[PDB]
Amino acid sequence: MSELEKAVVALIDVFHQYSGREGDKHKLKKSELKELINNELSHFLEEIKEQEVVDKVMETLDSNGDGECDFQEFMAFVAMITTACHEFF
């Protein structure tokens, strides 16, 4: 596998590591999303320590309004992050 293919696999792997913890196994609830960000995105995003920030991030990502972040909505988040990284080069 190429670096791009490895990246594709890592996206799938990390989403499901967190989404499968509790409740719906195919979606991230607030606590699963918070832990994903805090543990896995610490070089790109400040640690989330406040409920209001958890709530706002979920509200931002939950495009379909069901209160959880599904895989499509997670991919849109990843695109936001990758796009923002352009500021650094």
Binding site: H43, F44, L45, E46, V53, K56, V57, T60, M80, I81, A84, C85, E87, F88
Partner: peptide
Amino acid sequence: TKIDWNKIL
């Protein structure tokens, strides 16, 4: 690589 939260939210 710190992205300001305000550019995400």
